[PDB]
């Protein structure tokens, strides 16, 4: 047969990455994907799967595959896993307990940090309740943290809910930027995302 290559390079080798609060989702369909040239890459700091081994995935077909990409701190990548809590997992990106997929991350200090601070990567600091799995929140309403209510203005108990990381190349490895890619293997529709093993 003849098929397009799944555009994973557009996801992993992108020069620009989204903020975790506004995490970008790419829906991949009608293509062939070699999931072990990904796994067998020296690129990644993190490559854990919660469904089936990458070797087993080049056997199966899926109707849709999602590539969620964003940037967080090093010591925050542990939150991108089922049953984790923290500012990122609670307020920015939440995986379900029944997560079927893989979480991939690598250090991007050489590209996402600059002297003086890279303020373009943000994460949600405040929220009334936790996010549900795979929900996205791009709201920017003033969050009232104290007794006083604010009428849309930033106060001492009333914050802008987003927070810049301030990535610098001199930061510690835990405070350095890491790019994350979450692949979710959905099976609903025609299964047109497959591996090269059939």
């Amino acid at each position, epitope marked *: 047969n003849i098929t397009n290559l799944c555009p994973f390079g557009e996801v992993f080798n992108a020069t620009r990455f989204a903020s975790v609060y506004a995490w970008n989702r790419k829906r991949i369909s009608n293509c062939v994907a070699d999931y072990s040239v990904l796994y067998n890459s020296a690129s990644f700091s993190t490559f854990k799967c919660y469904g089936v081994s990458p070797t087993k995935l080049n056997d199966l077909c899926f109707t849709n595959v999602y590539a969620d990409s964003f940037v967080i701190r090093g010591d925050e990548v542990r939150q991108i896993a089922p049953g984790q809590t923290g*500012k990122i997992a609670d307020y920015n990106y939440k995986l379900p307990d029944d997560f079927t997929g893989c979480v991939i991350a690598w250090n991007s200090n050489n590209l996402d940090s600059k002297v*003086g*601070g890279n*303020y*373009n990567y*943000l994460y949600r*600091l*405040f929220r009334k309740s936790n996010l549900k799995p795979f929900e996205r929140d791009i709201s*920017t309403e003033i969050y009232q*943290a104290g007794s*006083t209510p604010c009428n849309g203005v*930033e*106060g*001492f*108990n009333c*914050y*802008f809910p*987003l*927070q*810049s*990381y*301030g990535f*610098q190349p*001199t*930061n*510690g490895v835990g*405070y350095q930027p890491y790019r994350v890619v979450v692949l979710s293997f959905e099976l609903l529709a025609p299964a047109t995302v497959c591996g090269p093993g059939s």
Partner: nanobody, 130 residues
């Protein structure tokens, strides 16, 4: 990485005053915010003051407003907190903390949210007693 060295504080009678200093060393950001927090016995740590790296955008809890003034040295990376008309309820350990400013849609925000602060000082004791 930046480090914060607190200085000042100690024991004072009701009605007295104090001045806390916090020296900021290391690779500072172009735009950041310095916050003063305090933790009293039997209570959670509370924010007291917040100031920009410029010296402006000062905010205070309504419990020290009018009595405390945060400021910045104009030739040094040291941030001051002048505390006037001290009362026994002001007795606490005072902490200096640094955080990055938030840049969004072409606008800077200088906040000092407790859970967001990136660097903390060791803290200094402040006792207001008779």
């Amino acid at each position: 990485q930046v480090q914060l060295q607190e200085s000042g504080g100690g024991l004072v009678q009701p009605g007295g005053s104090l001045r806390l200093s916090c020296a900021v060393s290391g690779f500072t950001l172009d735009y950041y915010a310095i916050g003063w927090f305090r933790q009293a016995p039997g209570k959670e740590r509370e924010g007291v003051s917040c100031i920009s790296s410029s010296g402006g955008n000062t905010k205070y809890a309504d419990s020290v407003k009018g009595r405390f003034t945060a400021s910045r040295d104009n030739a040094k990376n040291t941030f001051y907190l002048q505390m006037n008309s001290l009362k026994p309820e002001d007795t606490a350990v005072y902490y200096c903390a640094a955080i990055a400013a938030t840049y969004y849609s072409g606008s800077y925000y200088f906040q000092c949210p407790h859970d967001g602060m990136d660097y903390w000082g060791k803290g200094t004791q402040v006792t207001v007693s008779s």
